[PDB]
Design a protein around this ligand. Structure first.
Ligand SMILES: *[C@](O)(C(=O)NC1CC1)[C@H](CCCC)NC(=O)[C@@H]1[C@@H]2[C@H](CN1C(=O)[C@@H](NC(=O)NC1(CS(=O)(=O)C(C)(C)C)CCCCC1)C(C)(C)C)C2(C)C
Ligand SMILES: [Zn+2]
Ligand SMILES: [Zn+2]
Lengths: 22, 181, 151, 16
């Protein structure tokens, strides 16, 4: 039987931020 | 600070399948909740106090793909419906709730946080019922108190006519008991 | 990445706008009946409500909508134009007290911004700072109900 | 006159 694989992540530690321009 | 969350997909279908067989994942890990996949389903796994926990009905007794090959489960409890592997290097852990709040917040697979009112040791009601399709994939996800500490892990939806009005969860207490056994 | 809060400006000032339910909301005393800029030209307001100091345009590109609160919490959080989060204790239908007062400067340019609940859901729109001698100790806000009602 | 967007804030702090 196969391994459980991480296909993404959910981040709770992020705080409001101004989206930087590039 | 309010509870906010964001999701990021780290790999696709084929890369997932290869990694599943290989059991070797060299991807970088970040975050408190990992979006997890077997060959049949995708759900969530929450890191709490150094252990990455999830639902047994999802992970079964499988190992978790890591950069050092597959990692055996640290804990398994078919009854509590829990499994736990060492938290992946890179992940951040949540800590158990110690304020006994009844105002809970469920974090879904899509990174939405929905409020639920604790109505029992393993149950809470959705203040805003949603179709179960929304909750699909959220098993193993966290139920947080206002302070952002872990109260439980989403287990099953209590639905009727396809709409969920309540949720069933594994309170963080069962975690300590599983480790103690 | 998409943003729920837009930092906006007129020739006169700068303030904020918040996207809730597919509408980009802000304070009438900032925007007026002004139109909003777009790559295809200006787009007119979908909703104007001088009474509630509320105006809304169709949500712009690069934005995502905020979900209204449904938990009735009183522990609010005001997000400023500098992305600072300020804990506010709700005192009334449209009033809340800063848990830790701040000079007016700290809250300037943030009207139109959101007041979030513990779940990050929209409770109201920051309407104006209520200050005593240059110190904001409370704030006035437009509850989401008004927005949901105006739509 | 027209209101123009001079910046954006992402509440979750998503870098992506
Ligand atoms: C979770 O495993 C997951 O997301 N993984 C899948 C999607 C890839 C999943 C979450 C989906 C909820 C929408 N949870 C389950 O699959 C669990 C497991 C089996 C059944 N469910 C589950 O959620 C059931 N709900 C359910 O069984 N609920 C009750 C009974 S009931 O709903 O009141 C009724 C009698 C059927 C009307 C029993 C459990 C406690 C709550 C009530 C549904 C798939 C029907 C939503 C497990 C082991 C509980
Ligand atoms: Zn707590
Ligand atoms: Zn709320």
């Amino acid at each position: 039987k196969g391994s459980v694989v991480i296909v993404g992540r959910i981040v709770l530690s992020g705080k409001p931020a101004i989206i930087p321009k590039k | 600070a309010p509870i906010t969350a964001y999701a990021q997909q780290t790999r696709g279908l084929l890369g997932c399948i290869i990694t599943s067989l290989t059991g070797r994942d060299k991807n970088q890990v970040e975050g408190e909740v990992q979006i997890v996949s077997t060959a049949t389903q995708t759900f969530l796994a929450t890191c709490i106090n150094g252990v990455c926990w999830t639902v047994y009905h999802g992970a079964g007794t499988r190992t978790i793909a890591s950069p050092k090959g597959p990692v055996i489960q640290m804990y398994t409890n078919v009854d509590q419906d829990l499994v736990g592997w060492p938290a992946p290097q890179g992940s951040r852990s949540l800590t158990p709730c110690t304020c006994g709040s009844s105002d809970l917040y469920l974090v879904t697979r899509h990174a939405d946080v929905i409020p639920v009112r604790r109505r029992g040791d393993s149950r809470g009601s959705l203040l805003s019922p949603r179709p179960i399709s929304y909750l699909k994939g959220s098993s193993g996800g966290p139920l947080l108190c206002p302070a952002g500490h872990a109260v439980g892990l989403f287990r099953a939806a209590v639905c009727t006519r396809g709409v969920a009005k309540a949720v069933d969860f594994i309170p963080v207490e069962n975690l300590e008991t599983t480790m103690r056994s």
